Each structure stands twice: as C-alpha cells, then as structure tokens.
Amino acid sequence: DEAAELMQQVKVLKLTVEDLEKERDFYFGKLRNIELICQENEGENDPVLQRIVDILYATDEGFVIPDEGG
Amino acid sequence: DEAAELMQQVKVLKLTVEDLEKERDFYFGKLRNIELICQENEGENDPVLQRIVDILYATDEGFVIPDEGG
Amino acid sequence: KPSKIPTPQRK
Amino acid sequence: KPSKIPTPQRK
Secondary structure, X not given: OHHHHHHHHHHHHHHXXXXXXXXXXXXXXXXXXXXXXXXXXXXXXXXXXXXXXXXXXXXXXXXXXXXXXX | OHHHXXXXXXXXXXXXXXXXXXXXXHHHHHHHHXXXXXXXXXXXXXXXXXXXXXXXXXXXXXXXXXXXXX | OOXXXXXXXXX | OOOOOXXXXXX
C-alpha cells in the first residue's frame, strides 16, 4: 500500500535518525571538548595537537565554517 | 491526507538523515584519525592526550564498546 | 567556545 | 585501527 511504504519509511528513517543523531550528538559533544583542549595546551603544541587540529579543521569546499572572516 | 503527512515525514526525515549522517560520517572520520594519533604520540602522553582520550573513551552505560574484554 | 569548527548551516 | 572506541551495535 502507498502509505504502508511511506509509514515504513518513517520507521526506517526514525531508526536511521535515532542511529544517526545519537552518534551525531555524542560524537559532537566529544568534539567540543577537543577544540578548547587545543587552546588549553597550545603553549606546548606537540605534533598530535598539530594533526588533530588538522582533524578538527578538516573543512573543505562545500562545507560551512562558522565565524568565517579571520 | 494520511500519506501526505507520511511522505512529508520522509521528507523531513530525509532532511534530518542527510543533515545527520553527513555530520555523523564527517565527524566520525575525524575521530578515526584522533585514536591512532594517541598511539602515535603516547610516548609523550601530555595532558591534552589524557583528556582527549577521555574524550574518545567518553563511553557510559547503555553505550556499546567494541572489542569488549580487555 | 569558539564557533570556528566546520558546520553546516541548517538552522 | 583498533575498534575499541564506543559505538552502537546496529549492524
């Protein structure tokens, strides 16, 4: 049935959403603590902190960076 | 209409899915490079690397850790 | 914390 | 790379 697929879709999407945003939220909360940790230990800017800032700043074209202008 | 909401749901869920998994994927790919970077610089296990491993290992109850048993 | 890390715009 | 970082199970 038409709506049977549609409602099953929201099932799969609910599931994908719950799988997705559960990790998106958890992973992102983790990311918030790494950024300020870089400024907590910039001072001693060891290689890891040079390659993980590269990590944090892994932006590319098509991707949005906030506070763009410096 | 019944299916009109349902198909609009998959719209919103598609949108949420695309917003979600685009970040879930991007953020997680970033996370893959931090974990091995910790073992790249464990040797010199500075505070950052003690607090970001806490980050990477921010697990709790209800959350699954792979390779559980050591 | 300093909102410079890549995002989407979204909302 | 060493799959110890928290996950879900999912699939």
